[PDB]
Amino acid sequence: ASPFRLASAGEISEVQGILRTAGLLGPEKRIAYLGVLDPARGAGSEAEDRRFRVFIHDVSGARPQEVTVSVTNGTVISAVELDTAATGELPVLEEEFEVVEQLLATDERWLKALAARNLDVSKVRVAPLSAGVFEYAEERGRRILRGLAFVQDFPEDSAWAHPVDGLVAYVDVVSKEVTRVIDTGVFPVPAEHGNYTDPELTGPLRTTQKPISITQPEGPSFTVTGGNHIEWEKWSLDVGFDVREGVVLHNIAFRDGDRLRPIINRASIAEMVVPYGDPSPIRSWQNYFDTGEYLVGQYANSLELGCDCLGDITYLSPVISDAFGNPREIRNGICMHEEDWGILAKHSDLWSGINYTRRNRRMVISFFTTIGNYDYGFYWYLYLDGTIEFEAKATGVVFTSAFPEGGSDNISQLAPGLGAPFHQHIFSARLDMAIDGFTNRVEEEDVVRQTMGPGNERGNAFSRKRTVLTRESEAVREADARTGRTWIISNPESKNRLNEPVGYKLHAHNQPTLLADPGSSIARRAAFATKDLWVTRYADDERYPTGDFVNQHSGGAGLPSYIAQDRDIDGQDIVVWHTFGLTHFPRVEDWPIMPVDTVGFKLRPEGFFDRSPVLDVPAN
Amino acid sequence: ASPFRLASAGEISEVQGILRTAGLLGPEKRIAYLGVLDPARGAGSEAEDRRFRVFIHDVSGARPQEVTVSVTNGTVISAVELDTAATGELPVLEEEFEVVEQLLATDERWLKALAARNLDVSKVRVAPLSAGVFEYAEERGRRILRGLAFVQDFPEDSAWAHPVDGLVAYVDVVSKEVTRVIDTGVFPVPAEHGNYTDPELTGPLRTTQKPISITQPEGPSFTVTGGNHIEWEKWSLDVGFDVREGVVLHNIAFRDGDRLRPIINRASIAEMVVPYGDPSPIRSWQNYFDTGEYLVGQYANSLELGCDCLGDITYLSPVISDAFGNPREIRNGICMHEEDWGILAKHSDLWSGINYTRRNRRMVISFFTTIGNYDYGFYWYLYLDGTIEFEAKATGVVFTSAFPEGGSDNISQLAPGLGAPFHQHIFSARLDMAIDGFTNRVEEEDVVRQTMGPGNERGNAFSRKRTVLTRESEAVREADARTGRTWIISNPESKNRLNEPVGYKLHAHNQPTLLADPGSSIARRAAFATKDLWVTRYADDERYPTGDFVNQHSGGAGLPSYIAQDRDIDGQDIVVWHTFGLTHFPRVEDWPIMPVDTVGFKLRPEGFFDRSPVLDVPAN
Ligand SMILES: [Cu+2]
Ligand SMILES: [Cu+2]
């Protein structure tokens, strides 16, 4: 009867019934977000209260509502009218994707622009892109999408190969009006196709790959109980799923002898931003918060055995709500399997004659999502030795433009006339820490160079230093690869047998953070992305680094607002927010469909155990 | 009849015969190094000349010799007497390992030191450590090893758990004399054992791991011809083995349509340094060049199926020479296999309805070596998409000391009284580039931030810049993770279909480089380790970043000497030397045997192909 179980179809159907009976879900209403709430701190209240948070959009133009319901008692707990001109718009609705294209196909400004290019309107696909906040005063308080156009020569053609440059339009999707059509000039529409299943492009398929067969003759080493509770090789955790964040990990704990030791209370990718670095007015507004604006969980793929997931695979099929409150299953949306991971430890000793070798393994929990041209894999790994790792795998088709004549400093050429603007993919991991319990602190650890001198006569010594972050106002930290900078999360009140506080070390990849000018709109709205590491004091309502309503919010919400409270974080219930990402200068090899690139982070124990935790691993 | 084939037993036996007949391999002589020479530039000389380089040590104290022989003609090509006080000593001989311990067991200064500690001399193991170059004038021109002591309570005990601190001795191994015994004071010998196969330490072994079965029902997708030539998924290369460097990769090329395109002429780990950061006089001299001083190839493990290498494995068994010129096979010393590597590319398109997924694969070529307490895995990976990656896996037992009372800034405590000095493991990859041929150049590529202003009104733009390295004097480069700095090796004379030079991008991990003071002995001898990237003009005799004779060389040889020639490298036959390593602050979890930690680098194509090279990969 776990309070962390996945939402079921019945629960979502009950939410729909509660909302209807209360007068909050009539025919003009649409569910823009629905998700279970985590239990409050202190689950000592016997019998859970399963509560759901709902964002309700109104297609007639009335103010949207934030609603909290209790499925256990069948009641609405609170319902607030939202002022979107102040606190932001609701997430983009799937049913609004196609509205941008159909409104434009009857606008005389759009039709004139296509006529000048000799384009047939029935072939022109329009991408529904989030709008952000810029200089247009008339957009404040309106639900706006912007559209960029692509030509599809036939229904199975890859539109991405034929961008229509110099053209962009703004659309009010509630009142169904085209507010602006901007035409800066005619660019040739790149003519080459990018159809990666066309034999004339692929050539004959290779016949040289022989099968790799991965099987587990006795089944997998993990167990799944209660729908979503996993036990594997001393690890214990609950796999949750949220329509906004996707896969969420709860209650990550490690069985050290007879005691179950907490490590991480909740782990998630709480935000995602893709800023574009092309100064053209056609695209200079382009930034997508795939998590906060589009909800990456609702676009999760059904993963196919032997193709997306290879081996002995256990699936979860999470349930989300559609825009009317009906339950919708994402079949095979989450893959879980263990896999071989090479040598764990090895030594051949000259003096004792003992030869020792052990294999490593990792548990894999993953899902894939597709938002327009992009596809992202999210991978959580648990290792035998206590290491936790996250990996994002980026692929799909690159977003394209024309490639200007005479060149560009902000676009690379993929094909004759075909460009791909420079951009970043930046992630925010939110790690609600519980190292051996909830009294935690973070230290920044730097390598220390020492000078040749007395007490260091041969000039060989080096050391390290640790700086405790004591208040939120000093807990906004930058990477420093040169000094080997890492961060340790420790529990000052739980000691290992050497009398040191137990800890975990965060190892970052030290990739560049947000490159946009600090005075830009995106730097205000994506402030979390300007620094590598933030630490806050836990609070129930501080869930996203960008705030609750990212769509068309003017900036400053989320982490900078939280940090300003300057709360005590030295030995407290704390949350670590780690920013990491990829800076993408597209290459020719990324076209017409791009090979996976990856980024991530990991946490390794740092005096958490009293000795290696994998001494009891057998030889096999 | 490849000139790059592995040396055979017959060839080594013929070298021994040639050397004997010439009067160069009498009973007082020992082969300290023997290896095949690569062909000269321009193999248009029909019928190869298989030539071998040999370092001949003389145990009676005569000057050592460097000898080059031609096995094809049965002749000595050149023989030079070496002046070791000028150009360095020969590599450590395996038969000199045990000499340090036996000389000390009859030295009255050593015996007195053990008596004060109540240690039984028959239980005291002495590690034969390379000496380096410091203040001791009497060592110039002498072959010296230094010894640190460990107690072995019984023949199967792990001596590493019982370091004898405060004691060190220097030994002349040719004249068999103890030159110095230094006793700075008594430390308790840590008492806890570190026996990781002892049930009282491991507890009962886990019964929860079920088997993972990896098989290839039709065999592997690669072919091996001529002993060591590999073809796999458009890749082509020769796997070489050198007693000093270990696994060497030759002639890495990629089949792009009908043409075979060179990428890398020769790839190797050309040096390895492990500097210790403990200022105690007992250990402040401690630096090991495992490659240059000990020769990591001669310590390669025989790798066991299902334990070290899992799957459908093809083995190579390289042949090296022992100290008398007899051939010695390292059975199953090299593992090669392919393995599954997750998603290669994936896209689900909203407009075309096409769902596309492809798997990735990598070819693995690896060996493991053991030098005293350390064990290192060297892993080369070839990927379907043109990526080449190297990974070093570090494990074994950490080098120990006493942990001082009152603490230390340069040692961490692993166990009551047991310390592990801080240290680094730093590698030098030597990449003789041949991107589409031999006319290559290197550019340093940095991310460029742009200011909000005219032509960037929304402050979103960012760019990149590339700086060509034109002469060796400007080709000593530092990492800069903050600006995303990478290096591109291109061929200015070979263009892709977009009229840009073809290239490969080097992605570093940006870990710290050598931390020792720049005035130290180790900074002079390991100068390559002070910078991340060096580029030289190819020359036949510039093989190692530290020079040919690293043992007891005073400093400056190798890369700093090469660089000083200030040769033209803009569109020339060039060599890239990349420094990368791990900075190791040992943790409790590293004891009593440490879980693998890793470091490496990779190279990805950068406009080398005209589109993605994996369009022809099938679905499976
Ligand atoms: Cu990208
Ligand atoms: Cu180490």
UniProtKB/Swiss-Prot annotation, chains A, B:
Quote the Pfam families the UniProt record gives: AGAO-like_N2, Cu_amine_oxid
What cofactor does this protein call for? Cu cation; L-topaquinone
The record's free-text note on cofactor binding: Binds 1 copper ion per subunit.
Q: Could you tell me the keywords of this UniProt record?
A: Copper, Disulfide bond, Metal-binding, Oxidoreductase, TPQ
Task: Kindly state a single biological-process term from the GO annotations of this entry.
Answer: amine metabolic process
Query: Cross-referenced SUPFAM superfamilies, in alphabetical order?
Result: Amine oxidase catalytic domain, Amine oxidase N-terminal region
Superkingdom of origin:
Bacteria
- The first-level EC class reads oxidoreductase
Q: Which residues bind substrate?
A: 288-299, 371-376
Which cysteine pairs are joined by S-S bonds? 309-335
| Induction details | By phenethylamine.
Give residues where 2',4',5'-topaquinone occurs.
Answer: 374
List the PROSITE patterns hit by this protein, alphabetically. COPPER_AMINE_OXID_1, COPPER_AMINE_OXID_2
Answer whether the UniProt record assigns the keyword Oxidoreductase to this protein: yes
- Residues involved in Cu cation binding: 423, 425, 584
The GO terms this record gives for MF are:
copper ion binding; primary methylamine oxidase activity; quinone binding
As for PTM, the annotation reads:
Topaquinone (TPQ) is generated by copper-dependent autoxidation of a specific tyrosyl residue.
Q: Which EC number(s) does the record attach to this protein?
A: 1.4.3.21
Ranges that cross the membrane: none
Catalytic reaction equation(s): a primary methyl amine + O2 + H2O = an aldehyde + H2O2 + NH4(+); 2-phenylethylamine + O2 + H2O = 2-phenylacetaldehyde + H2O2 + NH4(+)
Question: Where do the catalytic residues lie?
Answer: 290, 374
Binding partners and assembly: Homodimer.
Which family does this protein fall into?
A: Belongs to the copper/topaquinone oxidase family.
* Summary of the function given for this chain in its UniProt record: Catalyzes the oxidative deamination of phenylethylamine to phenylacetaldehyde with the concomitant production of hydrogen peroxide and ammonia.
What protein does this entry describe? Phenylethylamine oxidase
Which organism does this sequence originate in? Arthrobacter globiformis
**Lineage per the UniProt record:** Bacteria, Bacillati, Actinomycetota, Actinomycetes, Micrococcales
